[PDB]
Amino acid sequence: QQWKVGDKCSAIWSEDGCIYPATIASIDFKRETCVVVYTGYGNREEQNLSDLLSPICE
Ligand SMILES: Cn1c2c(c(=N)c3c1CCC3)CCC2
């Protein structure tokens, strides 16, 4: 997938290694990272772009 800022996705939370819904807050194209915000949980963390999942994965 080609992701954009604001996209809904699912990501693997670094704390528990499980998949959750999130929104892309920003993308660093040089570093190939992004920051996601976990829906309903308020927190954010960086992900590798390559690691994001379809927003249907939950
Ligand atoms: C399940 N969970 C998740 C996140 C949390 N901050 C917290 C929980 C549990 C409490 C904090 C991020 C994505 C999933």
DSSP per position, 17-40? --EEEEEEEEEETTTTEEEEEETT
- Write the DSSP symbol of residue 49: G
Are 38 and 20 a contacting pair, CB within 8 Å? yes
Give me the CATH topology for the region 1-58. SH3 type barrels. (2.30.30)
Q: What is the dihedral of CA 40, 43, 44, 45, to 10 degrees?
A: -120
Distance CA 25, CA 47 (A): 11
**C-alpha 32 to ligand 1 mean position (Å):** 24
Are 34 and 22 a contacting pair, CB within 8 Å? no
17: Cβ contacts below 8 Å, ≥ 6 apart: none
From the alpha carbon of 43, which atom of ligand 1 is closest? 6
State residue 50 phi and psi, 5-degree precision. -60, -25
The residue contributing the CA closest to ligand 1 atom 8 is: 41
From the alpha carbon of 41, which atom of ligand 1 is closest? 6
**C-alpha 41 to ligand 1 mean position (Å):** 6
Domain extent listing, the chain: 1-58
Tell me which amino acid residue 56 is. Answer: I
